[PDB]
Amino acid sequence: LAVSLQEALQEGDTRALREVLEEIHPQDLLALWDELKGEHRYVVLTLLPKAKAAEVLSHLSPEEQAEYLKTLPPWRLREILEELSLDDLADALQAVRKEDPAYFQRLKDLLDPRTRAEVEALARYEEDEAGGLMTPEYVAVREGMTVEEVLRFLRRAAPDAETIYYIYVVDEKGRLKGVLSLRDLIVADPRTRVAEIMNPKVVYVRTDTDQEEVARLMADYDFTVLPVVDEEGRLVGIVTVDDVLDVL
Amino acid sequence: LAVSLQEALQEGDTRALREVLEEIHPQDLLALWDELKGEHRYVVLTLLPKAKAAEVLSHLSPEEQAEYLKTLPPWRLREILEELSLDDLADALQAVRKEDPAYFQRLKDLLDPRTRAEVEALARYEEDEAGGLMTPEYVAVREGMTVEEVLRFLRRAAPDAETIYYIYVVDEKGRLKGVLSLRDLIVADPRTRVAEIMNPKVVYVRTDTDQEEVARLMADYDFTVLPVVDEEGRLVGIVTVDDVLDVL
Amino acid sequence: AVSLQEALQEGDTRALREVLEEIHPQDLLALWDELKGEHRYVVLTLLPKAKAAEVLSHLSPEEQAEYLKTLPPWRLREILEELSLDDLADALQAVRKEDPAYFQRLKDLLDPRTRAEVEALARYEEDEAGGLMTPEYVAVREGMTVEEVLRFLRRAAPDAETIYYIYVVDEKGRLKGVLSLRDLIVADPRTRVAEIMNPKVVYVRTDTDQEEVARLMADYDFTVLPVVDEEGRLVGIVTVDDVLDVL
Amino acid sequence: LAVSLQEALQEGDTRALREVLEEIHPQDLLALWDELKGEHRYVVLTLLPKAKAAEVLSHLSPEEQAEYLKTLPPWRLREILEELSLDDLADALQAVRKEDPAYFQRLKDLLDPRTRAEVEALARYEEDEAGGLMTPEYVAVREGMTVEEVLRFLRRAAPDAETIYYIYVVDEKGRLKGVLSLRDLIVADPRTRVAEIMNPKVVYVRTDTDQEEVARLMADYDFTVLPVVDEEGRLVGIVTVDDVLDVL
Ligand SMILES: Nc1ncnc2c1ncn2[C@@H]1O[C@H](COP(=O)(O)OP(=O)(O)OP(=O)(O)O)[C@@H](O)[C@H]1O
Ligand SMILES: Nc1ncnc2c1ncn2[C@@H]1O[C@H](COP(=O)(O)OP(=O)(O)OP(=O)(O)O)[C@@H](O)[C@H]1O
Ligand SMILES: Nc1ncnc2c1ncn2[C@@H]1O[C@H](COP(=O)(O)OP(=O)(O)OP(=O)(O)O)[C@@H](O)[C@H]1O
Ligand SMILES: Nc1ncnc2c1ncn2[C@@H]1O[C@H](COP(=O)(O)OP(=O)(O)OP(=O)(O)O)[C@@H](O)[C@H]1O
Ligand SMILES: [Mg+2]
Ligand SMILES: [Mg+2]
Ligand SMILES: [Mg+2]
Ligand SMILES: [Mg+2]
Ligand SMILES: [Mg+2]
Ligand SMILES: [Mg+2]
Ligand SMILES: [Mg+2]
Ligand SMILES: [Mg+2]
């Protein structure tokens, strides 16, 4: 299959190339990523579907992340940057700023105003603490909602959430008050209020919490996702376990 | 023509395309503007000579104005920003802050100090009043100047003036005192003083004045340009009829 | 002229420094592009800062920008701090036309007040009064007596653009009268300014066109002209040398 | 030796000088600092390796700090600002703000967002209290970690830590609960938990504590570092004695 794109690569006509790419897996593209030359990398990135383009970008080394964000054509930029999970977006920009603070500024200029807001908050954190690892794309609900309401909410919180298997519950002020699983929603009666299904003794993590402490906590409680809070006890993000394996 | 453009786009060769853009009229490009795909618009705006690029921009909707002031490359920005007439520059910046005040701020930073000085003044007026429509790029002279001197002045005022067919006359304090046309000047004797050709009975409009009042007034007296004064009677700008036709 | 080149052959600081300290800026200005990067670099290396600045104020905007990029940064703040504010603005503008990043850097090098001062001037049209004026004039109050004004002028002199014309403002700084150095000298040392000053002052607005400044300058046969803002406050003076230079 | 430096300045030739700068100690450079003229200091700062360049800046008077942050070329600025310890960077930026608030602002723009985040936090505290002296670059751990885990932890905490000879202990909420020394970790069993080596009897100082008290307290208990907490008991920084010796 590596030759299969190169077959399509050499073919010069995109149409053959576009049908392989739409079924190539990111990781299988990631593996063969560095036997590819500038013109190749350029064209595959010219119209690799934006979800996949973004996905590959996230798994490259910071050096190559920066290189690729100076490679792709600018009409493609806002797409890819807007497709990135915010955690991955921050990492990408930090990678960029390390070599080119000017371009870092340029990139952020491209963002939708809310997205820039979001990333700018995340970027303020130490890359190797919870904040530097978290993403704000989680599902939060309040105590009074019933299970039915929570499900209807999750099915449109779904397009953009990092994960929906864990639903966090905060109050009026947005401070953490409980945690609930998708599995829990399912076993329970649709009009059960969340307040008796939620677990009130939530294990949480601070934005300055060291990543290996996050890793230990994750291995101890055997959770794949962990909530992150600010000084006021407010849920500000979640750290997913995949992003913790990557610190090894 | 239309085919002349699309051919050049697909060929990828900037030869055919710079050849098309340097002779295409902005309005013919504006007409086909939303038969264009993201990469196309980028490329036309990357290589359309700056005066036309600015021309198109002024005729896009505020929404696309904001968007394309974000797609274009930064070296192109300061050009387009400096190439806009000050009324249109103000409009464009307003369109941007409506969506993205962060980027609104970064843009103004790109402006030269005179332009930021100038634009910030206009930005202070209500967009549907005389100030929201005026430009400071008008030509003013004193009553004592001779037709010969006024004419020599026009030839170095022209590059930047909105219009030079009407010449406005102010005093020591710069408050409005008279008006004369380029035609009155040509009909007149080269050593004739302005104070004797000018019309002292000038119809003016205040920054306060609602845009439709600018329209009724423009239509009655059949002027294509109308002067704006402040509360102390000082000329601060002129409103031309084209910007008033565009109020529909 | 070769007297320069002999100093070149010397390779010597002193041999070159001795001619540079007695060369007139205009005589340096004439042969300036009989000089190569190597020459201009070294002449600028230790040419006395006042003169260095003087030459700079008189180069074409393209070469000014170049000149501000050749000299070593320890010399930059010197030369920049020596420029009259009118000339400093013009120099930075020249730079920004080609390189806005460097324009930003230069301004970073300024003393905070000089930056403030230049930044005000930079907002004006290069060909209107504000673009031509310099804020380095002498202002006094109406109640001062002649001796007091002279005292001021003797320490106002080092930095003032000119001291031959003294302008009179009030508590809030609106123009009140104009006075000459000559008037001060013919006059009695305890005479108050308010009886010697001329109250009907001819002024120019910051948006006033430069050729109107030239006419006014030629009509009233003045060499310096005061510039005011919209509130009637003296904000600068335009000297006639800078108006001849528009021709 | 010391005189060998002036040789290289006079050499005009860079290589002779880079050899000197590469082995001169900051203090030996600081000693001779104002027998130097502008052209020299510039060149010494043009070519002095960034840790040393930052070291010298840090021991200069606030006035020369402010000055030399203006003489150095901007490509060096971002280096030196990022190379400073956070306590010193906060001190240096204040030195600049006292003379030139405009430039004070531009510098902060050069800062990386986490660095700006951190420094802005330190800037809020009074220069003559614990906050004005502390640095957040300390190492904190949990009670449950073993001696083994911490020792592994310190080997990736050290590069940025002010000091690692004292390791501090906080809880779920990050409030101070205990202290232990690096020697305590080394003597102890690799499987021993921190909660059993740590001294729960911690001597602390709040952010508003006057410097003289930090000195009084440091001299009594014969400590070289002292922890700082907020009003809710959360560890926010450490004060080292070298910054207390330099209060004279
Ligand atoms: N951050 C958290 N803090 C506290 N409890 C949590 C947190 N995240 C999830 N939980 C709890 O963990 C459980 C979710 O586990 P899941 O439903 O995946 O089943 P599991 O891993 O097989 O274990 P079990 O079936 O025993 O719950 C729920 O009880 C949920 O309340
Ligand atoms: N805003 C204004 N207020 C008052 N008077 C004006 C204004 N604008 C123009 N005028 C006067 O009206 C006249 C219109 O002159 P213009 O150059 O438009 O000639 P025209 O319309 O081609 O010929 P005509 O005016 O004789 O029909 C000008 O000479 C000017 O003096
Ligand atoms: N900008 C100005 N506006 C109005 N009056 C001025 C201005 N500048 C100078 N004057 C006045 O005009 C006169 C010029 O005197 P100056 O020092 O030029 O000697 P002069 O050329 O012989 O003039 P005079 O013959 O009038 O004395 C002085 O009285 C001065 O106060
Ligand atoms: N800030 C502090 N507050 C309270 N206790 C502290 C603090 N810092 C250190 N300690 C305790 O004081 C002890 C002294 O530290 P350290 O081991 O460096 O001492 P030492 O001089 O090497 O040997 P000794 O402790 O025998 O004098 C540490 O073991 C630690 O438990
Ligand atoms: Mg990260
Ligand atoms: Mg993730
Ligand atoms: Mg408008
Ligand atoms: Mg217009
Ligand atoms: Mg000027
Ligand atoms: Mg001058
Ligand atoms: Mg401090
Ligand atoms: Mg310290």
Q: Which of B166, B162, B164 is nearest to B134 (CA)?
A: B162
Given a contact cutoff of 8 angstroms between Cβ atoms, the answer to whether B194 and B208 are in contact is no
Superfamily of domain A1-125: MgtE N-terminal domain-like (1.25.60.10)
Q: Which residues contact D35 (CB under 8 A, 6 or more apart)?
A: none
Within 8 A of B168 by CB-CB distance, chain C residues are none
Report the alpha-carbon distance of residue D246 to residue D62 in Å, rounded. Answer: 13
Q: Determine the residue type at B124.
A: R
C245 annotated ligand-binding residue: yes
CB contact under 8 A, D114 and A101: no
Report the alpha-carbon distance of residue B33 to residue A154 in Å, rounded. Answer: 39
Q: Which residues contact A166 (CB under 8 A, 6 or more apart)?
A: A138, A139, A179, A180, A181, A182, A225, A238
- Method of determination is X-ray
Given a contact cutoff of 8 angstroms between Cβ atoms, the answer to whether A198 and A142 are in contact is no
Could you say which of B113, B153, B174 has the minimum Cβ distance to residue C123? Answer: B113
> Which tokens belong to A101?
């603070």
Any idea which ligand is nearest the CA of C197?
3
Report the alpha-carbon distance of residue C187 to residue C166 in Å, rounded. Answer: 14
Which residue in chain B has the smallest CA separation from A73?
A: B39
DSSP conformation letters of chain A: -HHHHHHHHHH--HHHHHHHHTTS-HHHHHHGGGG--HHHHHHHHHSS-HHHHHHHHHHS-HHHHHHHTTTS-HHHHHHHHHHS-HHHHHHHHHHHHHH-HHHHHHHHHHS-HHHHHHHHHHHTS-TTBHHHH-BS--EEE-TT-BHHHHHHHHHHHTTT-S-SSEEEEE-TT-BEEEEEEHHHHHHS-TT-BGGGTSBSS---EETT-BHHHHHHHHHHTT-SEEEEE-TTSBEEEEEETHHHHTT-
Q: Which of B91, B98, B96, B101 is nearest to B122 (CA)?
A: B91
Report the alpha-carbon distance of residue B82 to residue D129 in Å, rounded. Answer: 50
Across the C:D interface, residue pairs with CB atoms under 8 Å apart total 24
C102 annotated ligand-binding residue: no
Q: Which residues contact D248 (CB under 8 A, 6 or more apart)?
A: none
Report the alpha-carbon distance of residue A238 to residue B240 in Å, rounded. Answer: 56
Superfamily of domain A126-248: CBS-domain (3.10.580.10)
Instruction: Kindly compute the dihedral angle of the four CA atoms of residues A107, A109, A113, A114, in this order, to the nearest 10 degrees.
Output: 30
DSSP conformation letters of C18-79: HHHTTS-HHHHHHTGGG--HHHHHHHHHHS-HHHHHHHHHHS-HHHHHHHHHHS-HHHHHHH
Q: Determine the residue type at A58.
A: S
> Strand pairing partners for B237?
B228
DSSP, res D210: B
Gapped junctions in chain B, after residues (C–N > 2.5 Å): none
**What phi and psi, each to the nearest 5 degrees, are found at residue D124?**
-70, -20
Specify the CATH architecture of the domain C1-124.
Answer: Alpha Horseshoe (1.25)
Q: Which of C146, C93, C79 is nearest to C121 (CA)?
A: C93
Distance from CA of A109 to the nearest CA of B (A): 6
* Chains D and B physically touch (3 or more Cβ atom pairs below 8 Å): no
Indicate the pairing of strand A166-170 with strand A176-181.
antiparallel
Give the length of chain A.
Answer: 248
**D205-206 β-sheet, strand order:** D205-206, D225-229, D235-240
Within 8 A of B102 by CB-CB distance, chain A residues are 113, 116
> Strand pairing partners for D235?
D229
Give the length of chain B.
Answer: 248
**B166-170 β-sheet, strand order:** B140-141, B166-170, B176-181
D220 annotated ligand-binding residue: no
Could you say which of C96, C123, C203 has the minimum Cβ distance to residue B117? Answer: C123
Half-sphere exposure of D174 (CA within 13 A, CB side): 24
**What phi and psi, each to the nearest 5 degrees, are found at residue C206?**
-65, -30
Report the alpha-carbon distance of residue B139 to residue B149 in Å, rounded. Answer: 13
Answer whether D227 contacts ligand 4 (Cβ < 6 A).
yes
Report the alpha-carbon distance of residue B111 to residue A153 in Å, rounded. Answer: 46
- List, in sequence order, the alpha helices (H) in chain B: 2-11, 14-21, 26-31, 38-47, 50-59, 62-71, 74-83, 86-99, 101-110, 113-123, 130-133, 147-157, 182-187, 211-220, 241-245
For residue B165, what are the CA distances in angstroms to A197, B151, B179, D22? 78, 11, 11, 70
B244 C-alpha vs ligand 8 centroid, how far in Å?
9
Could you say which of C105, C112, C115 has the minimum Cβ distance to residue D74? Answer: C105
> Which tokens belong to A17?
């190339």
A231 C-alpha vs ligand 11 centroid, how far in Å?
23
| Domains in chain C: boundaries | 1-124, 125-247
D107 C-alpha vs ligand 12 centroid, how far in Å?
21
- Say whether C165 sits in a helix, a strand or coil: strand
Kind and range of the H or E element at B205?
A: strand B205-206
Tell me the longest C-alpha to C-alpha distance in chain A. 61
C27 annotated ligand-binding residue: no
C170 annotated ligand-binding residue: no
Given a contact cutoff of 8 angstroms between Cβ atoms, the answer to whether C149 and C156 are in contact is no
- Say whether D41 sits in a helix, a strand or coil: helix
- Say whether B138 sits in a helix, a strand or coil: coil
Answer whether C191 contacts ligand 3 (Cβ < 6 A).
no
Whether CATH 2.40.128.20 fits C125-247: no
**What phi and psi, each to the nearest 5 degrees, are found at residue D5?**
-60, -50
DSSP, res B234: B
Tell me the longest C-alpha to C-alpha distance in chain B. 62
Owner of token pair 């960077």:
D89
Report the alpha-carbon distance of residue C48 to residue C66 in Å, rounded. Answer: 19
Dihedral sign, Cα of residue D71, residue D75, residue D76, residue D81: positive
Owner of token pair 């030839």:
B155
Burial class (CB in 10 A: 0-12, 13-18, 19+), A173: exposed
Report the alpha-carbon distance of residue B119 to residue B70 in Å, rounded. Answer: 19
Give the length of chain C.
Answer: 247
Within 8 A of C118 by CB-CB distance, chain D residues are none
Given a contact cutoff of 8 angstroms between Cβ atoms, the answer to whether A93 and A123 are in contact is yes
Indicate the pairing of strand C175-180 with strand C165-169.
antiparallel
Given a contact cutoff of 8 angstroms between Cβ atoms, the answer to whether D191 and D132 are in contact is no
> Strand pairing partners for A53?
none
Could you say which of C123, C126, C212 has the minimum Cβ distance to residue B142? Answer: C212
Cα–chain-centroid distance for residue A180? 21
Answer whether C184 contacts ligand 3 (Cβ < 6 A).
no
Which residue in chain C has the smallest CA separation from D43?
A: C74
> Which tokens belong to A169?
């519950």
Which residue in chain A has the smallest CA separation from B102?
A: A113
Report the alpha-carbon distance of residue B12 to residue C130 in Å, rounded. Answer: 49
Given a contact cutoff of 8 angstroms between Cβ atoms, the answer to whether C232 and C168 are in contact is no
Dihedral sign, Cα of residue A117, residue A121, residue A122, residue A126: positive
Q: Which of C184, C175, C177 is nearest to C227 (CA)?
A: C175
Q: Which atom of ligand 2 is nearest to the CA of B225?
A: 1
Answer whether D199 contacts ligand 4 (Cβ < 6 A).
yes
What is the distance in angstroms between the CA of the first residue and the CA of the last residue of chain A? 29
Report the alpha-carbon distance of residue D53 to residue D41 in Å, rounded. Answer: 11
Instruction: Kindly compute the dihedral angle of the four CA atoms of residues D151, D157, D161, D166, in this order, to the nearest 10 degrees.
Output: -20
For residue B164, what are the CA distances in angstroms to B179, B238, C209, D33? 12, 11, 15, 63
Given a contact cutoff of 8 angstroms between Cβ atoms, the answer to whether B238 and B229 are in contact is no
> Which tokens belong to A173?
């002020």
Same fold, C1-124 and C125-247: no
> Cβ of A121: how many Cβ atoms within 10 Å?
19
Instruction: Kindly compute the dihedral angle of the four CA atoms of residues D220, D221, D224, D229, in this order, to the nearest 10 degrees.
Output: -100
> Strand pairing partners for C175?
C169
Owner of token pair 């911490």:
D150
Q: Which residues contact B167 (CB under 8 A, 6 or more apart)?
A: B139, B140, B141, B150, B154, B179, B180, B181, B182, B185, B194
> Cβ of C193: how many Cβ atoms within 10 Å?
23
D62-71 and D86-99 helices cross at what angle (nearest 10)?
90
Report the alpha-carbon distance of residue B124 to residue B131 in Å, rounded. Answer: 8
A94 C-alpha vs ligand 11 centroid, how far in Å?
27
Within 8 A of A101 by CB-CB distance, chain D residues are 78, 110
Give the length of chain D.
Answer: 248
Within 8 A of A106 by CB-CB distance, chain B residues are 74
> Which tokens belong to A121?
């908050």
Given a contact cutoff of 8 angstroms between Cβ atoms, the answer to whether C113 and C121 are in contact is no
Residue A148 Ramachandran class (φ > 0 left, ψ -120 to 50 alpha, else beta):
alpha
> Which tokens belong to D46?
């043009």
Which of the other chains make 3 or more beta carbon contacts under 8 angstroms with chain A? B, D
Answer whether B138 contacts ligand 2 (Cβ < 6 A).
no
